[PDB]
């Protein structure tokens, strides 16, 4: 698209080679000199290193806890730049930024990429519907969606099924688990009493990594209680 | 090599109030361009911080008068003529020609809105993680605006710690009030140990903390 | 088989002696629409997914996709008008109660 | 028994040959189009699987000819093409994914005009009576007969409409087209959304002098589902400013289970005339049945928009 | 308004020649009166644990028994639940405040 295309990042395990292709288009990548400043989660940038333009003798000089396996390259004539990643470890988890510096012809921010170095492979979420069983509020159904037990913390997409005006969803921040790496979070939703009084079962839709979207479906409660008599 | 810093870390300003932040030169500020290293960042959520003035002494095409690139040599300066409640974040001065990136130390921003009581809504946990070994006890608290909260999950009166914690979101983009979230992890094993499970969250904006208790066995 | 087993299964009644297997299986110009094809229609039918197939769903089936080749309106209209040509004088709600096995008692 | 070069006006074969080879290009039918003149493969989806084609294509050449016998959907995506004069007489074109008669997608400025397309349609992931989902174009002096058929139970969401199925872009609109649609479907749960004309309209989308007439049928009330459109919530932020306009909308529908003009209302309804006759428009579960939502008015008959019989395909 | 047309069920807890125990039906049981009838009229009732409970539209039997003097008596409770608003009172709803079993046990 219209960013900064970084390749072959992604999941891997610790001490393995990670390769990365930030890749450009519609800009001359030529006249503006690829820098690769990774960033902690949450953190500030972290300084790495670059490699100078094709005019500028495309000098590649390494940070110093980092040098000694880094190959930083580029290609031109692609539109592309290179990272090389070798010996992973826990501390190599960042959020990689390849930018463009050295050209006022283009200064476009890019997106970056995530790296995330643990041997776990990824883990699909446990979708657990939540229901509100306890009294609803007066005006609003409130209804959540639970996914636990989920290793990759790159994008997870919660959207629900139908919303409308009066709907505001909220969704929190990956939380990571005390065991296994593993990641966990909820999604909140607020609906209309209106809507769920005709029906209207609002589905859960939750995104991973890689796995596809597991619609689980929440039957939203307007169930009038059974009046079951006693036995007399 | 050419050292970019910041003295201020954290601040909280009200919309429509002046910030000024000044960023200094260790290094020469020879850039590719010959213009100067320093390059202004403002943090936005969702994304990372985005420049707002670039070459130093030229003003960006674009920026508001809000940010001012005026500073020039070693010395630069930049304002916040007025705050946004969209302008939280922090704020970083950096060099773009040499290999050291050197990053300001940042002054990450926040605004200041009217303390307000978040809404309680307890979720039981679901019977299907149960069958799992695990369990999920869900306390939720919506749009509050001081982040600064303490959650205790008291098992049977009880606080453990250690296994289940909180999760709060940011600034919201309507009214930038934040919401909490926490999730009680118990294993199947303490599950059945215990019978009445319960959500305490301190807060400022609270006059009391509000806790609502599910008996074992209600799904 | 799909096919032809629903049909067989869901249409076992017999108006007098005719029997509604042969006439809905075969004569499906017995209201007009001459073009149609029995074996087509089996096929289809038996193509048509497990929603359609699906027994809950039998009057919504013929509505929506048997329809239109017996040139019908409803499933109801097409066992009126069966009920019309053969065994005429005796109305429809008397040839029902003839007709199911199950014991149907009624209080005016 | 011949074939044509210099224009392909001959066979479907070889302007689907054409189309493969030159997606970029100005092309023109002479003659009368069977499309199971081509084998379909089983892999392939759509009887053009290039990015765009059929970017200069039209029926203009004296007499407008018809394309009879579709199997699968036309093309695979539009980038500023042009179809131009297009009938359609038979059409079984089905698949589980996106299915429409004529492109599954259209990413920018591509305008439609004349098209007429007339058969089944059937789909499961998603279904478009003209295009499943269309981006940043427009479509004028169109028409669809026929039935549709996505009563699958799945919980995944399809935009389904009687001519587009989803419609998001600021610059995207339907204005003067036809649904004679026969549909019956099962919207199921309510991100599946169901329109008579549109299926859903999105990023300030108007429709402006559309007519439905053919039935709308969701069995289960549950889903969004409308007689000429089915909402126009956008999925982004909620503002009414993208929710997008209906204009001069008229709906003879006799839509069971939803509503006759806009199958969810809002507060601030930015369509500007709504047009019913007197039809099927009565379709604890107290409001999952309609009582005239937003179609109480012009409930007379109203004339009818007269861009169906010029056409003239025969 | 009395001509409308609502369903009661009896409880699908079917016997056995052996002993009385009337084990419940599931729609995947194999006595054949749900394989044939009960199956394919398909629509799911909660089975409670106890009390023939109305649902608004409709009625099952749970507990009761419909032959029975207390099946009756049980009807006419479960009508009073089923036709309250509209038919009983003069098209008149219930009371803002009482529930819906005020008017079941105590009177009608």
């Known amino acids: 698209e219209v960013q900064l295309v970084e390749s072959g990042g992604g999941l891997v395990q610790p001490g393995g080679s990670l390769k990365l292709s930030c890749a450009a288009s519609?800009?001359?990548?030529?006249?503006?000199?690829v820098h690769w400043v990774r960033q902690a989660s949450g953190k500030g940038l972290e300084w790495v290193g670059r490699?100078?333009?094709?005019?500028?003798?495309?000098?590649?000089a390494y940070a110093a806890s980092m040098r000694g396996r880094l190959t930083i390259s580029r290609d031109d004539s692609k539109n592309t730049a290179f990272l090389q990643m070798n010996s992973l470890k826990s501390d190599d988890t960042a959020m990689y930024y390849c930018?463009?510096?050295?050209?006022?012809?283009?200064?476009?921010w890019g997106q970056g990429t995530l790296v995330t170095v643990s041997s776990a492979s990824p883990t699909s979420p446990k979708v657990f519907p939540l229901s509100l069983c306890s009294t609803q509020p007066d005006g609003n159904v409130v209804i959540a969606c639970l996914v636990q037990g989920f290793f990759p913390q790159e994008p997870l997409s919660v959207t629900w099924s139908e919303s409308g005006q009066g709907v505001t969803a909220r969704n929190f921040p990956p939380s990571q688990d005390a065991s296994g790496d593993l990641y966990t979070t909820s999604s909140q939703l607020t609906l209309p009493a209106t809507q769920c009084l005709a029906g209207k079962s609002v589905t859960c839709h939750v995104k991973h990594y890689t796995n596809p979207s597991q619609d689980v479906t929440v039957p939203c409660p307007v169930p009038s209680t059974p009046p079951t008599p006693s036995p007399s | 090599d050419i050292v970019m810093t910041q003295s201020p870390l954290s601040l909280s300003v009200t919309p429509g109030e002046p910030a000024s932040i000044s960023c200094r030169s260790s290094?020469?500020?020879?850039?590719?361009?010959?213009?100067?290293?320093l390059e202004w960042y403002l943090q936005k959520p969702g994304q990372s911080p985005q420049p707002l003035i670039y070459?130093?002494?030229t003003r960006a095409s674009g920026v508001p008068d809000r940010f001012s690139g005026s500073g020039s040599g070693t010395d630069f300066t930049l304002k916040i003529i007025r705050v946004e409640a969209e302008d939280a974040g922090t704020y970083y001065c950096?060099?773009?020609?040499?290999?050291?990136?050197?990053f300001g130390q940042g002054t990450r921003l926040e605004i200041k809105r009217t303390v307000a009581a978040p809404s309680v809504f307890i979720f039981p946990p679901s019977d299907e993680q149960l069958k799992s070994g695990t369990a999920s006890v869900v306390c939720l608290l919506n749009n509050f605006y001081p982040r600064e909260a303490k959650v205790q999950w008291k098992v049977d009166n009880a606080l453990q710690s250690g296994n289940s914690q909180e999760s709060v979101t940011e600034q919201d983009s309507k009214d930038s009030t934040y919401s909490l979230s926490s999730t009680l992890t118990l294993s199947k094993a303490d599950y059945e140990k215990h019978k009445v499970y319960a959500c305490e969250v301190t807060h400022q904006g609270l006059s009391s903390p509000v806790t609502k208790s599910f008996n074992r066995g209600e799904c | 088989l799909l096919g032809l087993t629903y049909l067989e299964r869901w249409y076992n009644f017999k108006y007098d002696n005719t029997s509604a297997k042969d006439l809905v299986l075969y004569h499906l110009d017995f209201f007009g629409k001459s073009n149609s094809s029995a074996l087509d229609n089996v096929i289809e039918l038996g193509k048509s997914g497990f929603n359609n197939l699906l027994a809950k769903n039998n009057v919504i089936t013929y509505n929506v996709l048997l329809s239109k080749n017996y040139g019908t309106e409803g499933l109801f209209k097409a066992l009126e008008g069966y009920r019309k040509v053969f065994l005429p004088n005796v109305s429809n709600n008397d040839w029902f109660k003839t007709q199911s096995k199950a014991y149907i008692v009624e209080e005016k | 028994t011949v074939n044509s070069e210099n224009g392909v006006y001959t066979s479907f074969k070889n302007l689907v040959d054409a189309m493969n080879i030159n997606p970029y290009g100005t092309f023109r039918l002479g003659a009368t189009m069977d499309a199971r003149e081509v084998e379909l493969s089983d892999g392939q989806e759509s009887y053009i699987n290039k990015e765009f084609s059929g970017k200069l294509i039209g029926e203009n050449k004296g007499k407008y000819y018809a394309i009879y016998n579709l199997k699968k959907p036309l093309f695979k995506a539009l980038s500023h093409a042009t179809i131009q004069d297009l009938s359609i007489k038979e059409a079984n074109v089905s698949s589980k994914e996106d299915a429409a008669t004529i492109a599954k997608e259209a990413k920018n400025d591509t305008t439609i005009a004349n098209v007429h397309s007339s058969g089944v349609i059937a789909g499961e992931r998603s279904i478009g009576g003209l295009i499943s989902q269309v981006t940043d174009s427009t479509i004028s002096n169109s028409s669809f007969t026929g039935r549709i058929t996505n009563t699958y139970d799945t919980t995944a969401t399809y935009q389904i409409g009687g001519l587009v199925g989803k419609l998001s872009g600021v610059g995207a609109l339907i204005e003067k087209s036809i649904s004679s649609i026969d549909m019956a479907t099962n919207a199921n749960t309510g991100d599946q959304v169901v329109g008579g004309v549109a299926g859903v309209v999105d990023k300030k989308a108007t429709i402006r002098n559309s007519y439905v007439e053919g039935n709308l049928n969701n069995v289960k009330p549950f889903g969004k589902v409308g007689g000429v459109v089915g909402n126009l919530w956008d999925r982004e932020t909620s503002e009414v400013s993208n929710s997008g306009n209906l204009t001069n909308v008229l709906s003879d529908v006799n839509v069971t289970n939803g509503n006759a003009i806009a199958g969810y209302d809002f507060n601030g309804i930015k369509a500007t005339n709504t047009y019913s006759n007197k039809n099927n428009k009565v379709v604890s579960k107290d409001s999952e049945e309609q009582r005239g939502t937003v179609l109480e008015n012009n409930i007379v008959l109203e004339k009818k928009i007269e861009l169906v019989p010029k056409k003239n395909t025969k | 308004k009395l001509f409308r047309s609502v369903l009661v069920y009896d409880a699908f807890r079917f016997g056995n020649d052996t002993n009385k125990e009337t084990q419940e039906a599931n729609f995947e049981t194999n006595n054949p009166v749900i394989k044939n009838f009960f199956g394919p009229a398909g629509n799911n009732v909660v089975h409670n644990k106890h009390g023939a409970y109305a649902t608004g539209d409709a009625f099952y039997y749970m507990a009761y028994r419909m032959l029975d003097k207390s099946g009756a008596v049980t009807y006419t409770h479960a009508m009073t639940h089923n036709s309250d608003r509209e038919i009983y009172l003069g098209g008149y709803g219930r009371r803002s405040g009482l529930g819906p079993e005020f008017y079941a046990k105590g009177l009608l």
């Open positions: 490699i100078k333009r094709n005019a500028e003798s495309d000098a590649t």
């Open positions: 950096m060099q773009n020609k040499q290999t050291p990136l050197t």
């Open positions: 519609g800009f001359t990548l030529s006249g503006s000199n």
């Open positions: 070459l130093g002494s």
């Open positions: 930018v463009i510096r050295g050209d006022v012809y283009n200064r476009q």
């Open positions: 290094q020469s500020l020879l850039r590719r361009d010959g213009h100067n290293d």
